[PDB]
Paper text:
Toward this goal, the present work describes the use of bovine pancreatic ribonuclease (RNase A) crystals with a pore size of 4 nm (P3221 space group) for fixing [Rh2(OAc)4] and developing a heterogeneous catalyst to perform reactions in an aqueous medium. The structure of the [Rh2(OAc)4]/RNase A adduct was investigated by X-ray crystallography: the metal complex structure remains unperturbed upon protein binding. Structural analysis demonstrates that 1 h of soaking is sufficient to metalate the protein and that the crystal packing does not influence the binding of the metal compound to RNase A: two binding sites were identified for the metal compound, close to the His105 and His119 side chains, in agreement with that observed using RNase A crystals in a different crystal form. Overall, our findings demonstrate that the dirhodium paddlewheel complexes can be fixed in porous biomolecule crystals, like those of RNase A, to prepare biohybrid materials for catalytic applications.
Crystals of the adduct with [Rh2(OAc)4] were formed via soaking using RNase A crystals grown at pH 5.2. To characterize the metal binding process within the protein crystals, X-ray diffraction data were collected on RNase A crystals exposed to [Rh2(OAc)4] for different soaking times (1, 2, and 6 h). Hence, three different structures of the [Rh2(OAc)4]/RNase A adduct in the P3221 space group were solved. In all of the structures, two binding sites for the metal compound were observed, close to His105 and His119 side chains, as observed in previous reports. Close to the His105 side chain, [Rh2(OAc)4] (occupancy = 0.70–0.78) is linked to the Nε atom of the imidazole ring and to a Cl– ion through its axial positions. The axial binding of the Cl– ion to the dirhodium core is not surprising considering the high concentration of NaCl in the crystallization conditions. A Cl– ion is found at the axial position of the dirhodium center also in the case of the metal-containing fragment bound to the His119 side chain. However, at this site, the remaining axial position of the dirhodium core (occupancy = 0.50–0.55) is coordinated to the Nδ atom of the His imidazole ring, and the dimetallic compound is equatorially coordinated by three acetate ligands and two water molecules. In the structure collected after 1 h of soaking, a double conformation of the His119 side chain is observed. In conclusion, considering that the occupancy of dirhodium does not significantly change between 1 and 6 h of soaking, it can be assumed that 1 h of soaking is sufficient to metalate the protein in the solid state.
Residue numbers in the entry: 1 to 124
The structure:
C-alpha cells in the first residue's frame, strides 16, 4: 500500500527534466507513472522542481483547498510545471493528452508527520 505522500510523488513529481520539451510529454508520462492503467486519469500536473522545493510549499502561503479544508498551501514563487489534460477524443485504453508547459504557482494539500504534500489542488 502506497502512502499518500508516495502517491503524490508518483503522480506529480518530475525532477528529471527542467520542462516538457515535446507535445508528447504527457502521453509518455501518464502512461509510465501508471496513471492510465485502469482508466485515463483526466487531469494531472507534473512539477519540475526538486522534491525538497515541493515539500517546502507546506511551509508557505496557507490557503483554502477547493474542498473547503484549510490544509492547502500556495508556493510563494512560480515553478516549472506541465499540465496534462485528456483530449475529448481520448478513450481508454488509448489515453491521449494535451501537454501544456508553464511556470505557475502550485497549490498542494499537506498532511502528516512530517507534514508533506498529499494532493495537488491547482496551479495559479
Ligand atoms: Cl487517493
Amino acid at each position: 500500500k502506497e502512502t499518500a505522500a508516495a502517491k503524490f510523488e508518483r503522480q506529480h513529481m518530475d525532477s528529471s527534466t527542467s520542462a516538457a520539451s515535446s507535445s508528447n510529454y504527457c502521453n509518455q508520462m501518464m502512461k509510465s507513472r501508471n496513471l492510465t492503467k485502469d482508466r485515463c486519469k483526466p487531469v494531472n500536473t507534473f512539477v519540475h522542481e526538486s522534491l525538497a522545493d515541493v515539500q517546502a510549499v507546506c511551509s508557505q502561503k496557507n490557503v483554502a483547498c477547493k474542498n473547503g479544508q484549510t490544509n492547502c498551501y500556495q508556493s510563494y514563487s512560480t515553478m516549472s510545471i506541465t499540465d496534462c489534460r485528456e483530449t475529448g477524443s481520448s478513450k481508454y485504453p488509448n489515453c491521449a493528452y494535451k501537454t501544456t508547459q508553464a511556470n505557475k504557482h502550485i497549490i498542494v494539500a499537506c498532511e502528516g508527520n512530517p507534514y508533506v504534500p498529499v494532493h495537488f489542488d491547482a496551479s495559479v
